[PDB]
Amino acid sequence: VRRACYGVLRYIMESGAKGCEVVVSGKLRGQRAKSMKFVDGLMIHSGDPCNDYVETA
């Protein structure tokens, strides 16, 4: 989760994206759940570009 999900981070940066973040949350069987954000780039989160530029699933 810290490497194979880290490999697909700039597997998509080859197209020329402005930035990508990947939030993977849950338990690592330390049953208290954790979450680390894989930030890389210049990402908006707000305003009209939030409806426009960013895309999430």
């Binding site: 810290r2 490497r3 880290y6 680390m36």
Partner: protein
Amino acid sequence: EDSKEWVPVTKLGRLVREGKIKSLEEIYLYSLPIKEFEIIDFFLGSSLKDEVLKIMPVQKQTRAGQRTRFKAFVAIGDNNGHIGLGVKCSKEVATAIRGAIILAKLSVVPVRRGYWGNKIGKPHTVPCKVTGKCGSVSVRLIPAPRGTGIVSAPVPKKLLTMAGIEDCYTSARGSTGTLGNFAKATYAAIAKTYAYLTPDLWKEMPLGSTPYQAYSDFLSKPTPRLH
């Protein structure tokens, strides 16, 4: 193993890339800083092994409430007498390791090894008795005679095989249970090996060649020209 060759952003990194000098000790002779890490893995790096020491967490109290920077200690070394420590804290443990290797490849300092009472056969351990402090931990180094395998704790055991020294006796004053400040206290000693004025070095010398002024108007060009 470049695999993409990088531009020299500094001055003497271009001279390294120009082939103006093939002597790493020429940098050490005038004590000008190796500023970019791409310098020495051109001069060195042929399976020059490093190993991490110490990656224990370091926290900071915030409002909600405690976030961790993982600080790494990496130790790189030439077995013919060069050494380095890496000291870098990061967010997570991957870039803690890789970020300090650049710092490990920039703190690379030559090691003076020598003889004690018998000028026979590949200078072995240390020319004299040296020590160095950082934060209460002192480590004297004793020139042990031939075939007297390393007498130290495991933190400078793995560090002094990377230094080109045959064997050592050592006597470490201080709180050496802090496994990172132990490592940095050894280096102030080994950096003093080329700072002790032995009577081997009482002649005057050929004074140097001034690598700025000797290679001056071959840098009056404005181009970053390699070979």
